[model samples]
Target: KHLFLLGGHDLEMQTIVQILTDRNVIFKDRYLQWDNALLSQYEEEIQQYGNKEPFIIYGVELKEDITPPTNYIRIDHHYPSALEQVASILDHPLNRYQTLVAANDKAYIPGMLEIGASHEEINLIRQEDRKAQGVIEDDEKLAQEAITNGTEKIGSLYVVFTTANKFSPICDRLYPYEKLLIYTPNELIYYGKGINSIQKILKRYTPISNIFWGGGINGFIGTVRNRLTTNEILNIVEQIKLLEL
Candidate 1:
């Protein structure tokens, strides 16, 4: 009978371990698998023991699919209702917000920041934060220029390398920012995350929707699910110009 606990170099994980320790919970051992890449090696121990042991697993783990023994329990935020139940015990606002955001996928950084600590193990979140902020600035500038010129006259954000240098004005406006897209005469270039998941629609069948766009963090990171007729592309450009200022 043992508690096979998982922890990360993050406050939430640390707090979890602390709670388990405080209660004198059965988890009296710890294992460190630096990163997800290193987690698989422990699978034998995790599954074999986890499947038929007196153990409870809390916090993060490397497995996507875990089948616990009849007498075991697994609590993880990514799983259904796992975080919500944990939140009730936590009585922490951030813990609850984490549950809410995971449920709806509406909020990202803001809710995560409230959890426990910032500047956690991963610096990737900060990088994304910067990218999101840059997108916000770009959106505002795009809108402003449209208002100024009385049109949303824009150039290719991503086209083939041939026309990569064509949009000097938008380039200058977004100068120094890394260009995310550059497509050719018959290619689609979208500059955003999450939309990649939407692009999967293309692999299955041609899309019939005239447009697909979604953004978040107060329009910080925008996505365009670009799969349309050539004419519709230009149509959207003009429609964007006509947006009410």
Candidate 2:
């Protein structure tokens, strides 16, 4: 028996869970969400199977304090080396849906569009992912309002500074733009064209620990550290614009 611990309830992980269920594999799946609280719930079972077989961990990056099973297969794309498709690690050729899931996991909306995913297909998948992430209708409405009234153009980038907790809906609305930067009190996300260059520029000014490329060359989502002011972020964006010329 194998236990599969997932990092989140996103579409990518949910697809894997369905595949495991379809094959009638004897396994258990739990959502850990990058924390150790859920792991404590499985401590006894994990210890019992520690020596006999390796647990399969997908997507979750364990903290330093927790003790992992003696034997385990950990697959995650967040690391520099593990940037390939997670489903491909299962050693099976990918079908169409699986391919979409893998590509979306890596490059997000752009990835799906590059593969010629129909608009309806893309919308359905995005909706499913939003549902899985607990994004409600109110969130979508707020994102729409922000895009309509709050967004602005800085140099070539479409910029929006919002307090909206959910960023995905805003990203979805702004994806058509050539470049975009979404800023909140706690997070900053940059995507669309020239994102790779912008990410490189931002790194020089920001602390390395606060910037995360998330295994995608096209975009990155970063955490806002203490004492980082909004003016600083705008200045960073200004620097990127200056460097682009």
- Any runs in candidate 1 off by more than 4 Å, and if so which? 1-4, 7-9, 26-61, 64-68, 78-106, 112-245
Clashing pairs in 2: none
lDDT of each: 0.38, 0.64
Candidate 2 per-residue lDDT, tens place, 151-170, comes to 87766777787777777888
Best by TM-score: 2
On residues 1-245, what C-alpha lDDT tens digit does candidate 1 reach at each position? 44544533333344445555655554422444334413344456566666455554443433444444454455555434433444444553444423433432223444445554244411334333333223344544443453345322234232212122122223223323322332223333433333444345333334435334446422211223345455544443333323311
Name the 10 consecutive residues with the lowest summed lDDT in model 1.
159-168
Global lDDT for candidate 1? 0.38
Model 1, residue 230: C-alpha shift (Å): 33
Judged by lDDT, which candidate is best?
2
